[PDB]
Amino acid sequence: NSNSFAGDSSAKQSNSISGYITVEVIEVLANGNLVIRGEKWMTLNTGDEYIRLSGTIRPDDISFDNTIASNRVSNARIQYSGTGVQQDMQEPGFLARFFNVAL
Amino acid sequence: DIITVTLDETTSATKSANADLSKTNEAQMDPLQVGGEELQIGGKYNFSYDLNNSNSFAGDSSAKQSNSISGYITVEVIEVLANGNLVIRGEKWMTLNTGDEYIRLSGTIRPDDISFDNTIASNRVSNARIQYSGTGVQQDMQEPGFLARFFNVAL
Amino acid sequence: NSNSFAGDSSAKQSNSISGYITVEVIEVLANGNLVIRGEKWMTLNTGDEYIRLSGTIRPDDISFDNTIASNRVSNARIQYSGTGVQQDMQEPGFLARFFNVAL
Amino acid sequence: LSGTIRPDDISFDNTIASNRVSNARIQYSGTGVQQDMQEPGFLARFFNVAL
Amino acid sequence: LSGTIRPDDISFDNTIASNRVSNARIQYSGTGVQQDMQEPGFLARFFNVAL
Amino acid sequence: AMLQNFGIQMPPGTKPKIKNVAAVMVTAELPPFSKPGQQVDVTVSSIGSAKSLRGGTLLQTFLKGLDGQVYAVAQGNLVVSNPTVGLISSGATVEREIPNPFGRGD
Amino acid sequence: AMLQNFGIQMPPGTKPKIKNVAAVMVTAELPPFSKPGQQVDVTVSSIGSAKSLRGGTLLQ
Amino acid sequence: LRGRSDPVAGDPAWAPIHPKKKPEHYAAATGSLFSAEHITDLYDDSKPRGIG
Amino acid sequence: TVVDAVEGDKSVDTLRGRSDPVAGDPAWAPIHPKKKPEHYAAATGSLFSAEHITDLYDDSKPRGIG
């Protein structure tokens, strides 16, 4: 006789963003926390890119030069993307989406 | 109240087991010859024999599992317990180019474990629920679908 | 004549786990021992893994940083596993189980 | 593990060696299909007890 | 293990050597199908006692 | 630990470098029929390596009975003559009563 | 061990560096018909290497 | 077809127990702020000693 | 019913020839120590109880059930 079995699974995920974004306070909470929100648009040659950030921060986390790290932002929503025909090349479309969801 | 969580998790587990059994026999005797002739028992039986056995077994099993997450997540206190422990909860969404990823953390922490810079390690969070995943067509590529799931659960 | 015999048997087993798990006291015993219990879930990309620990500990074994080794836990129940299609790949199924129990 | 020990053999950190345990019963094993692979079964057991 | 010992031979850590045990009976063995592989059985025993 | 009780928590491994604080053992004798609100003497003796307890002030300490319960709280100013043992004339305030069999029986 | 009985537990291997504490053996003779609540004399003798017990206080 | 039942996150058999709330002292009965269930020792290490 | 909702129902061996152990067997479960009786200090006027006193200098070796 000879019986044998082997089974494995794996997964991996990572991301990173680097840059700057200047926002403004849109609401002050009861404990003094500041709800922040802002957007930033850049058109370099062709195509518009935007950065959008919203969240809540502590005034205690704001450094001396009026700068706060992005990992100190509570309820963070960070969006860095493009727009137009430049962004059309980043998505496969219906044809590949159906094939990817079926197989 | 805003509390920053340092995601630093690393778990690793291995197990192994195996067994062996073996047995052999080898007994051989040439026909006995006494007085120049071959001795006979009964009418047709010699003084000879030949035995040869060989049994063998081997069986093993193994398993292994590990994971790790690294990053930051800032949450807020949603409830204060009777002993002063803080129930925390929060989410964090990032859209980089295409596709949205989220980090979600909930749990209960001690104020004594919050360091001087208002940061607490993720292994200090009781009843921790950490979720780091994607969304959309990006996440569709990470799962096999019905076809492979049926084949994997049948075999 | 020539007779010969040889027979041997062997076995081996080992395991290890490394990580952290934070639990809570669910009961205090008469001598001051603490019955502990807790679970921890992590979804990294796809599939959920859990760690579960229960047992009884001495307050004398709790170190200065409120941490206790896992080998100091009496009646320990440690479970580290997955869930879903990821865990389906780790088991052979009925077909190989019958062959393994028959041979 | 079960057995009988002397309090004199318990070290300062509340730990005692396993060779100091009287009437010791130590069992380290598995369970389930993992343990099924460690035993030969009836077929090889009969062959091993006959030869 | 069974036997008879002198209290004078018990060292400071409550340990005594096995060669100091009078009427010693030391048995170290297995049990079950593992021990079945250690013995030849009737077939080889008869051949070994006849030749 | 006492500083944590007031909202100041030093990072782990920080050496306080304190020179005006000494760890002591506080002992009080509870007279019979002691009622809550009364004051009793306490003897304060140093258990570490402090050279003198003269001029010190005993911080809030809970005095436990033989059953492990707190029956008094001790504070006050030490009066030392042996410079490592001092006395306080009303250091401990009684906070709990101990029952008595005086009124029972014939 | 006494400090653990009060809620202060030093990490293992920590040297207290105590200089005002001495280990002693306490002996008392219980007179006949001794009733609970009575007080008797005790003799306190040092068993370690303390130079003097003068001015000390015997703990429980 | 699996032969196993996967655990669910949030099972009450493994969920934490929130500690019972201590009763109020009612200092007006004794004239003192001392309560045996509410006092905090300044020098204790704060080991786990109760549910939660 | 006899099944608890929180814990749940805790309730080919012929081809195996062995019976696997179950986790939580009462034959191997720990024994919770008996609770000591209250002292009732009102009988003697003292907080001393032979079953409740704690020696300050003992090493606290295991000495009882649990």
Side-chain angles (χ1 to χ4, degrees):
Chain A
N1 292 137
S2 189
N3 312 338
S4 183
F5 165 81
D8 61 80
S9 64
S10 183
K12 198 168 305 184
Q13 181 157 345
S14 54
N15 65 1
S16 65
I17 188 175
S18 186
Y20 284 88
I21 170 73
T22 310
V23 291
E24 296 185 25
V25 173
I26 67 165
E27 177 174 5
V28 184
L29 302 185
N31 42 16
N33 288 16
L34 310 156
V35 184
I36 62 177
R37 191 186 63 193
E39 63 169 349
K40 171 185 187 176
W41 286 79
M42 285 167 294
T43 299
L44 305 180
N45 193 11
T46 43
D48 314 325
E49 335 176 74
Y50 63 93
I51 307 182
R52 296 182 162 172
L53 186 138
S54 64
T56 311
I57 64 176
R58 298 191 313 151
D60 306 77
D61 291 336
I62 299 170
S63 59
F64 179 63
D65 55 327
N66 198 78
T67 313
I68 184 176
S70 66
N71 49 262
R72 293 284 177 172
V73 178
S74 173
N75 216 24
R77 306 274 184 277
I78 308 176
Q79 303 168 33
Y80 182 30
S81 180
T83 288
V85 67
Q86 286 71 24
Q87 194 68 15
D88 284 332
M89 321 306 288
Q90 324 290 344
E91 287 119 7
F94 163 78
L95 301 180
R97 284 184 182 187
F98 176 75
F99 292 157
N100 292 326
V101 80
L103 283 313
Chain B
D1 293 329
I2 290 177
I3 170 69
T4 308
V5 174
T6 291
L7 296 179
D8 187 11
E9 298 279 22
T10 305
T11 320
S12 183
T14 70
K15 61 195 287 181
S16 186
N18 57 84
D20 284 312
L21 293 178
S22 174
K23 199 171 184 177
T24 187
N25 282 94
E26 191 180 14
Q28 204 274 337
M29 167 171 185
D30 294 341
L32 181 61
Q33 301 176 351
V34 179
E37 52 98 30
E38 177 168 304
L39 239 61
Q40 310 280 0
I41 8 184
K44 59 173 183 175
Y45 295 110
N46 281 332
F47 286 80
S48 69
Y49 52 76
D50 206 324
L51 171 71
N52 218 274
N53 292 137
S54 189
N55 312 338
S56 184
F57 165 81
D60 61 80
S61 64
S62 183
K64 198 168 305 184
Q65 181 157 345
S66 54
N67 65 1
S68 65
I69 188 175
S70 186
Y72 284 88
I73 170 73
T74 310
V75 291
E76 296 185 25
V77 173
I78 67 165
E79 177 174 5
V80 184
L81 302 185
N83 42 16
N85 288 15
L86 311 156
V87 184
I88 62 177
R89 191 186 63 193
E91 63 168 349
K92 171 185 187 176
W93 286 79
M94 285 167 294
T95 299
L96 305 180
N97 193 11
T98 43
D100 314 325
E101 335 176 74
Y102 63 93
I103 307 182
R104 296 182 162 172
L105 186 138
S106 64
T108 311
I109 64 176
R110 298 191 313 151
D112 306 77
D113 291 335
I114 299 170
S115 59
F116 179 63
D117 55 327
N118 198 78
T119 313
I120 184 176
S122 66
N123 49 262
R124 293 284 177 172
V125 178
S126 173
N127 216 24
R129 306 274 184 277
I130 308 176
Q131 303 168 33
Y132 182 30
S133 180
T135 288
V137 67
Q138 286 71 24
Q139 194 68 15
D140 284 332
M141 321 306 288
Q142 324 290 344
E143 287 119 7
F146 163 78
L147 301 180
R149 284 184 182 187
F150 176 75
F151 292 157
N152 292 326
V153 80
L155 283 313
Chain C
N1 292 137
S2 189
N3 312 338
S4 184
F5 165 81
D8 61 80
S9 64
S10 183
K12 198 168 305 184
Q13 181 157 345
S14 54
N15 65 1
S16 65
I17 188 175
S18 186
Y20 284 88
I21 170 73
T22 310
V23 291
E24 296 185 25
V25 173
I26 67 165
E27 177 174 5
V28 184
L29 302 185
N31 42 16
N33 288 15
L34 311 156
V35 184
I36 62 177
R37 191 186 63 193
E39 63 168 349
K40 171 185 187 176
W41 286 79
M42 285 167 294
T43 299
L44 305 180
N45 192 11
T46 43
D48 314 325
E49 335 176 74
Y50 63 93
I51 307 182
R52 296 182 162 172
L53 186 138
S54 64
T56 311
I57 64 176
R58 298 191 313 151
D60 306 77
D61 291 335
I62 299 170
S63 59
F64 179 63
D65 55 327
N66 198 78
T67 313
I68 184 176
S70 66
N71 49 262
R72 293 284 177 172
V73 178
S74 173
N75 216 24
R77 306 274 184 277
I78 308 176
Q79 303 168 33
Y80 182 30
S81 180
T83 288
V85 67
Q86 286 71 24
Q87 194 68 15
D88 284 332
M89 321 306 288
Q90 324 290 344
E91 287 119 7
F94 163 78
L95 301 180
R97 284 183 182 187
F98 176 75
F99 292 157
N100 292 326
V101 80
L103 283 313
Chain D
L1 186 138
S2 64
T4 311
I5 64 176
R6 298 191 313 151
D8 306 77
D9 291 336
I10 299 170
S11 59
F12 179 63
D13 55 327
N14 198 78
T15 313
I16 184 176
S18 66
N19 49 262
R20 293 284 177 172
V21 178
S22 173
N23 216 24
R25 306 274 184 277
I26 308 176
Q27 303 168 33
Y28 182 30
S29 180
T31 288
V33 67
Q34 286 71 24
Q35 194 68 15
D36 284 332
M37 321 306 288
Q38 324 290 344
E39 287 119 7
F42 163 78
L43 301 180
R45 284 183 182 187
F46 176 75
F47 292 157
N48 292 326
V49 80
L51 283 313
Chain E
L1 186 138
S2 64
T4 311
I5 64 176
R6 298 191 313 151
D8 306 77
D9 291 336
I10 299 170
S11 59
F12 179 63
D13 55 327
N14 198 78
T15 313
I16 184 176
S18 66
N19 49 262
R20 293 284 177 172
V21 178
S22 173
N23 216 24
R25 306 274 184 277
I26 308 176
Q27 303 168 33
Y28 182 30
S29 180
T31 288
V33 67
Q34 286 71 24
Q35 194 68 15
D36 284 332
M37 321 306 288
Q38 324 290 344
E39 287 119 7
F42 163 78
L43 301 180
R45 284 184 182 187
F46 176 75
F47 292 157
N48 292 326
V49 80
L51 283 313
Chain F
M2 177 190 69
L3 280 194
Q4 294 180 23
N5 282 113
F6 289 108
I8 295 90
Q9 176 170 335
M10 297 174 260
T14 295
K15 306 161 64 177
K17 300 174 308 180
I18 48 176
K19 296 180 165 50
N20 306 338
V21 191
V24 299
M25 271 288 158
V26 194
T27 304
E29 176 176 11
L30 215 58
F33 304 114
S34 292
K35 307 294 192 305
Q38 299 202 288
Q39 279 103 24
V40 304
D41 313 291
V42 289
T43 304
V44 180
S45 61
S46 178
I47 61 179
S49 60
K51 286 191 172 304
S52 184
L53 294 189
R54 196 182 312 262
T57 303
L58 176 64
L59 299 177
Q60 164 188 137
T61 161
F62 295 154
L63 301 175
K64 287 151 56 176
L66 274 182
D67 59 333
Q69 311 294 321
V70 176
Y71 284 87
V73 183
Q75 312 96 346
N77 304 278
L78 269 65
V79 174
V80 330
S81 303
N82 195 343
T84 42
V85 176
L87 319 173
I88 320 179
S89 298
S90 290
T93 304
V94 185
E95 308 284 355
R96 194 176 167 181
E97 271 196 45
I98 313 187
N100 220 62
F102 168 73
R104 315 279 203 176
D106 284 0
Chain G
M2 177 190 69
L3 280 194
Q4 294 180 23
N5 282 113
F6 289 108
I8 295 90
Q9 176 170 335
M10 297 174 260
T14 295
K15 306 161 64 177
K17 301 174 308 180
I18 48 176
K19 296 180 165 50
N20 306 338
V21 191
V24 299
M25 271 288 158
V26 194
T27 304
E29 176 176 11
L30 215 58
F33 304 114
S34 292
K35 307 294 192 305
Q38 299 202 288
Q39 279 103 24
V40 304
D41 313 291
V42 289
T43 304
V44 180
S45 61
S46 178
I47 61 179
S49 60
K51 286 191 172 304
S52 184
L53 294 189
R54 196 183 312 262
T57 303
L58 176 64
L59 299 177
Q60 164 188 137
Chain H
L1 279 181
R2 287 182 177 179
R4 76 176 201 281
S5 190
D6 288 339
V8 292
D11 197 319
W14 293 91
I17 307 173
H18 292 358
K20 193 190 303 182
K21 188 60 177 181
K22 285 134 52 180
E24 291 285 345
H25 166 40
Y26 191 66
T30 56
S32 174
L33 303 171
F34 178 87
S35 184
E37 312 88 14
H38 295 271
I39 51 173
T40 295
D41 186 51
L42 293 182
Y43 324 104
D44 200 313
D45 280 0
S46 295
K47 281 189 190 296
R49 57 195 61 172
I51 296 190
Chain I
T1 173
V2 298
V3 177
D4 189 65
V6 171
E7 69 170 13
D9 183 66
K10 304 209 63 180
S11 177
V12 75
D13 152 66
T14 303
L15 279 181
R16 287 182 177 179
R18 76 176 201 281
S19 190
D20 288 339
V22 292
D25 197 319
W28 293 91
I31 307 173
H32 292 358
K34 193 190 303 182
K35 188 60 177 181
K36 285 134 52 180
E38 291 285 345
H39 166 40
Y40 191 66
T44 56
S46 174
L47 303 171
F48 178 87
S49 184
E51 311 88 14
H52 295 271
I53 51 173
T54 295
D55 186 51
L56 293 182
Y57 324 104
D58 200 313
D59 280 0
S60 295
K61 281 189 190 296
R63 57 195 61 172
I65 296 190

PDB file of all heavy atoms in Angstrom, chain A residues 13-29:
ATOM      1  N   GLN A  13      -0.555  40.389   1.481  1.00  0.00           N
ATOM      2  CA  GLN A  13      -1.079  41.701   1.129  1.00  0.00           C
ATOM      3  C   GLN A  13      -0.209  42.782   1.746  1.00  0.00           C
ATOM      4  O   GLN A  13       0.242  42.642   2.884  1.00  0.00           O
ATOM      5  CB  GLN A  13      -2.525  41.863   1.592  1.00  0.00           C
ATOM      6  CG  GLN A  13      -3.133  43.194   1.222  1.00  0.00           C
ATOM      7  CD  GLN A  13      -4.637  43.147   1.165  1.00  0.00           C
ATOM      8  OE1 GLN A  13      -5.231  42.078   1.124  1.00  0.00           O
ATOM      9  NE2 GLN A  13      -5.265  44.311   1.158  1.00  0.00           N
ATOM     10  N   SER A  14       0.024  43.851   0.992  1.00  0.00           N
ATOM     11  CA  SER A  14       0.790  44.985   1.480  1.00  0.00           C
ATOM     12  C   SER A  14       0.402  46.226   0.695  1.00  0.00           C
ATOM     13  O   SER A  14      -0.127  46.131  -0.413  1.00  0.00           O
ATOM     14  CB  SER A  14       2.295  44.738   1.361  1.00  0.00           C
ATOM     15  OG  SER A  14       2.649  44.386   0.036  1.00  0.00           O
ATOM     16  N   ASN A  15       0.669  47.390   1.280  1.00  0.00           N
ATOM     17  CA  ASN A  15       0.492  48.654   0.579  1.00  0.00           C
ATOM     18  C   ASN A  15       1.358  49.712   1.238  1.00  0.00           C
ATOM     19  O   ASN A  15       1.851  49.534   2.353  1.00  0.00           O
ATOM     20  CB  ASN A  15      -0.976  49.099   0.542  1.00  0.00           C
ATOM     21  CG  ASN A  15      -1.547  49.410   1.914  1.00  0.00           C
ATOM     22  OD1 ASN A  15      -0.866  49.328   2.930  1.00  0.00           O
ATOM     23  ND2 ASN A  15      -2.818  49.776   1.939  1.00  0.00           N
ATOM     24  N   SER A  16       1.549  50.817   0.526  1.00  0.00           N
ATOM     25  CA  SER A  16       2.284  51.947   1.066  1.00  0.00           C
ATOM     26  C   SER A  16       1.911  53.191   0.282  1.00  0.00           C
ATOM     27  O   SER A  16       1.613  53.110  -0.910  1.00  0.00           O
ATOM     28  CB  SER A  16       3.797  51.719   1.008  1.00  0.00           C
ATOM     29  OG  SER A  16       4.250  51.632  -0.328  1.00  0.00           O
ATOM     30  N   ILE A  17       1.918  54.334   0.958  1.00  0.00           N
ATOM     31  CA  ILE A  17       1.769  55.626   0.307  1.00  0.00           C
ATOM     32  C   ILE A  17       2.762  56.584   0.941  1.00  0.00           C
ATOM     33  O   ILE A  17       3.042  56.502   2.142  1.00  0.00           O
ATOM     34  CB  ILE A  17       0.325  56.165   0.397  1.00  0.00           C
ATOM     35  CG1 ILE A  17       0.171  57.417  -0.467  1.00  0.00           C
ATOM     36  CG2 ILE A  17      -0.060  56.461   1.828  1.00  0.00           C
ATOM     37  CD1 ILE A  17      -1.228  57.940  -0.534  1.00  0.00           C
ATOM     38  N   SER A  18       3.322  57.473   0.128  1.00  0.00           N
ATOM     39  CA  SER A  18       4.280  58.459   0.600  1.00  0.00           C
ATOM     40  C   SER A  18       3.992  59.784  -0.084  1.00  0.00           C
ATOM     41  O   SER A  18       3.775  59.821  -1.296  1.00  0.00           O
ATOM     42  CB  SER A  18       5.718  58.012   0.323  1.00  0.00           C
ATOM     43  OG  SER A  18       6.652  58.904   0.901  1.00  0.00           O
ATOM     44  N   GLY A  19       3.981  60.858   0.690  1.00  0.00           N
ATOM     45  CA  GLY A  19       3.719  62.171   0.134  1.00  0.00           C
ATOM     46  C   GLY A  19       3.254  63.118   1.225  1.00  0.00           C
ATOM     47  O   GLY A  19       3.468  62.872   2.407  1.00  0.00           O
ATOM     48  N   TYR A  20       2.616  64.199   0.792  1.00  0.00           N
ATOM     49  CA  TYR A  20       2.050  65.181   1.700  1.00  0.00           C
ATOM     50  C   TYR A  20       0.655  65.548   1.228  1.00  0.00           C
ATOM     51  O   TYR A  20       0.344  65.472   0.039  1.00  0.00           O
ATOM     52  CB  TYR A  20       2.904  66.450   1.793  1.00  0.00           C
ATOM     53  CG  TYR A  20       4.159  66.304   2.619  1.00  0.00           C
ATOM     54  CD1 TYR A  20       5.340  65.863   2.047  1.00  0.00           C
ATOM     55  CD2 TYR A  20       4.166  66.620   3.966  1.00  0.00           C
ATOM     56  CE1 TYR A  20       6.486  65.731   2.792  1.00  0.00           C
ATOM     57  CE2 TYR A  20       5.307  66.490   4.720  1.00  0.00           C
ATOM     58  CZ  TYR A  20       6.465  66.045   4.129  1.00  0.00           C
ATOM     59  OH  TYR A  20       7.610  65.916   4.878  1.00  0.00           O
ATOM     60  N   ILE A  21      -0.183  65.945   2.179  1.00  0.00           N
ATOM     61  CA  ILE A  21      -1.520  66.449   1.896  1.00  0.00           C
ATOM     62  C   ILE A  21      -1.873  67.433   2.998  1.00  0.00           C
ATOM     63  O   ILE A  21      -1.720  67.128   4.182  1.00  0.00           O
ATOM     64  CB  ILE A  21      -2.560  65.313   1.800  1.00  0.00           C
ATOM     65  CG1 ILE A  21      -3.983  65.867   1.747  1.00  0.00           C
ATOM     66  CG2 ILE A  21      -2.425  64.356   2.962  1.00  0.00           C
ATOM     67  CD1 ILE A  21      -4.334  66.508   0.451  1.00  0.00           C
ATOM     68  N   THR A  22      -2.312  68.624   2.614  1.00  0.00           N
ATOM     69  CA  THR A  22      -2.697  69.650   3.572  1.00  0.00           C
ATOM     70  C   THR A  22      -4.215  69.750   3.601  1.00  0.00           C
ATOM     71  O   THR A  22      -4.850  69.951   2.560  1.00  0.00           O
ATOM     72  CB  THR A  22      -2.066  70.992   3.218  1.00  0.00           C
ATOM     73  OG1 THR A  22      -0.665  70.808   2.995  1.00  0.00           O
ATOM     74  CG2 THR A  22      -2.241  71.958   4.355  1.00  0.00           C
ATOM     75  N   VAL A  23      -4.793  69.599   4.789  1.00  0.00           N
ATOM     76  CA  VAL A  23      -6.241  69.593   4.954  1.00  0.00           C
ATOM     77  C   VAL A  23      -6.640  70.716   5.897  1.00  0.00           C
ATOM     78  O   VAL A  23      -5.800  71.517   6.314  1.00  0.00           O
ATOM     79  CB  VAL A  23      -6.736  68.231   5.470  1.00  0.00           C
ATOM     80  CG1 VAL A  23      -6.570  67.178   4.406  1.00  0.00           C
ATOM     81  CG2 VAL A  23      -5.978  67.835   6.719  1.00  0.00           C
ATOM     82  N   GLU A  24      -7.925  70.799   6.220  1.00  0.00           N
ATOM     83  CA  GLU A  24      -8.437  71.811   7.127  1.00  0.00           C
ATOM     84  C   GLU A  24      -9.427  71.182   8.093  1.00  0.00           C
ATOM     85  O   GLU A  24     -10.033  70.147   7.810  1.00  0.00           O
ATOM     86  CB  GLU A  24      -9.102  72.968   6.369  1.00  0.00           C
ATOM     87  CG  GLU A  24      -8.149  73.758   5.494  1.00  0.00           C
ATOM     88  CD  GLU A  24      -8.806  74.961   4.852  1.00  0.00           C
ATOM     89  OE1 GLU A  24      -9.796  75.466   5.413  1.00  0.00           O
ATOM     90  OE2 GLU A  24      -8.333  75.400   3.782  1.00  0.00           O
ATOM     91  N   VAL A  25      -9.583  71.822   9.246  1.00  0.00           N
ATOM     92  CA  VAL A  25     -10.525  71.363  10.258  1.00  0.00           C
ATOM     93  C   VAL A  25     -11.932  71.726   9.806  1.00  0.00           C
ATOM     94  O   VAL A  25     -12.204  72.877   9.452  1.00  0.00           O
ATOM     95  CB  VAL A  25     -10.209  71.979  11.627  1.00  0.00           C
ATOM     96  CG1 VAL A  25     -11.296  71.639  12.619  1.00  0.00           C
ATOM     97  CG2 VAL A  25      -8.866  71.490  12.129  1.00  0.00           C
ATOM     98  N   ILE A  26     -12.830  70.741   9.806  1.00  0.00           N
ATOM     99  CA  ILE A  26     -14.225  70.965   9.442  1.00  0.00           C
ATOM    100  C   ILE A  26     -15.166  70.862  10.627  1.00  0.00           C
ATOM    101  O   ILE A  26     -16.326  71.282  10.511  1.00  0.00           O
ATOM    102  CB  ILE A  26     -14.684  70.000   8.330  1.00  0.00           C
ATOM    103  CG1 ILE A  26     -14.720  68.567   8.854  1.00  0.00           C
ATOM    104  CG2 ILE A  26     -13.781  70.114   7.121  1.00  0.00           C
ATOM    105  CD1 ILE A  26     -15.478  67.620   7.971  1.00  0.00           C
ATOM    106  N   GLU A  27     -14.717  70.320  11.754  1.00  0.00           N
ATOM    107  CA  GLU A  27     -15.572  70.180  12.922  1.00  0.00           C
ATOM    108  C   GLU A  27     -14.700  69.959  14.146  1.00  0.00           C
ATOM    109  O   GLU A  27     -13.666  69.294  14.062  1.00  0.00           O
ATOM    110  CB  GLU A  27     -16.555  69.019  12.752  1.00  0.00           C
ATOM    111  CG  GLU A  27     -17.427  68.765  13.959  1.00  0.00           C
ATOM    112  CD  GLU A  27     -18.470  67.711  13.702  1.00  0.00           C
ATOM    113  OE1 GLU A  27     -18.453  67.116  12.606  1.00  0.00           O
ATOM    114  OE2 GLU A  27     -19.312  67.481  14.594  1.00  0.00           O
ATOM    115  N   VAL A  28     -15.119  70.522  15.273  1.00  0.00           N
ATOM    116  CA  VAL A  28     -14.446  70.342  16.553  1.00  0.00           C
ATOM    117  C   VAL A  28     -15.349  69.512  17.449  1.00  0.00           C
ATOM    118  O   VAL A  28     -16.527  69.839  17.627  1.00  0.00           O
ATOM    119  CB  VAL A  28     -14.107  71.693  17.205  1.00  0.00           C
ATOM    120  CG1 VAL A  28     -13.320  71.478  18.481  1.00  0.00           C
ATOM    121  CG2 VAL A  28     -13.327  72.554  16.241  1.00  0.00           C
ATOM    122  N   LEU A  29     -14.805  68.435  17.997  1.00  0.00           N
ATOM    123  CA  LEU A  29     -15.587  67.522  18.813  1.00  0.00           C
ATOM    124  C   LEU A  29     -15.627  67.991  20.265  1.00  0.00           C
ATOM    125  O   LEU A  29     -15.002  68.980  20.648  1.00  0.00           O
ATOM    126  CB  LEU A  29     -15.022  66.108  18.714  1.00  0.00           C
ATOM    127  CG  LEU A  29     -14.957  65.538  17.297  1.00  0.00           C
ATOM    128  CD1 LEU A  29     -14.511  64.095  17.332  1.00  0.00           C
ATOM    129  CD2 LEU A  29     -16.296  65.670  16.601  1.00  0.00           C
TER     130      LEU A  29
END
